[PDB]
Amino acid sequence: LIEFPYLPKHYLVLLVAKFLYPIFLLDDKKLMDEDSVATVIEVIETKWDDADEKSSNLYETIIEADKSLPSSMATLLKNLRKKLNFKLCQAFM
């Protein structure tokens, strides 16, 4: 509802880090979300196309107070590949 210039969208990279590694995506296998496996595959489109989203004033010493996988467990959004591959299971096409 907010697909304008208006509100910038570079906050959505601190916010969703330990959103998407916990159980709100998926972190098991075979979880489905209501109208929201097909609107979160188009913002992790961005984050593998060229480059992860910007913030690094507060995400390059706050990912290590979050305990997210990219800077902490060495492995990047190749563990959010794992957490889309485990709903090529039978919960997203």
């Binding site: 060495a74 492995t75 990047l76 190749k78 563990n79 590949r81 794992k82 591959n85």
Partner: protein, 154 residues
């Protein structure tokens, strides 16, 4: 005549068709020290045409190694037959505990050899993967983690 042929394979060398004329340093056959230089072409692309005629042809290519004159303290074939004992465990199934081969040893020498280029170090990790059930992997398979496969032992 031969001198102009030893400047052809320095001239027509470019970085697109590096392998075309580093092959005509190998098969050039008046050269020496092309024996680990072929390894900086065919390491970044161990892609070939992958049949037992290209592999038996690649046997004929590591016999060019011994055709070269033998230098003081340089020239060896006891760690370059690594990539030729590779072409003997890829037409054969048999789990090797080194009853057969100098080739898991040969990879480990090839992680103290790799010189020029760290994709000459990572091909050593790729030829690890092409030989599974025929090795038990006392080397490593090949940020990109999601699926290295940690189960191959029996």
């Amino acid at each position: 005549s031969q001198l102009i042929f030893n400047a052809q394979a320095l001239k027509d060398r470019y970085e697109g068709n590096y392998l075309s004329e580093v092959q005509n340093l190998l098969l050039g056959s008046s050269y020496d020290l092309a024996e680990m230089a072929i390894v900086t072409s065919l390491g970044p692309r161990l892609l070939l045409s992958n049949n037992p005629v290209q592999n038996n042809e690649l046997k004929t290519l590591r016999e060019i190694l011994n055709e070269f004159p033998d230098s003081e303290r340089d020239k060896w074939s006891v760690s370059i037959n690594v990539f030729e004992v590779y072409l003997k465990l890829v037409l054969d199934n048999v789990e090797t505990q080194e009853t057969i081969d100098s080739l898991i040893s040969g990879m480990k020498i090839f992680y103290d050899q790799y010189k020029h280029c760290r994709e000459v170090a990572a091909c050593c990790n790729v030829m690890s993967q092409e030989i599974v059930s025929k090795i038990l992997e006392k080397n490593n398979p090949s940020l990109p983690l999601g699926q290295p496969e940690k189960a191959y032992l029996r």
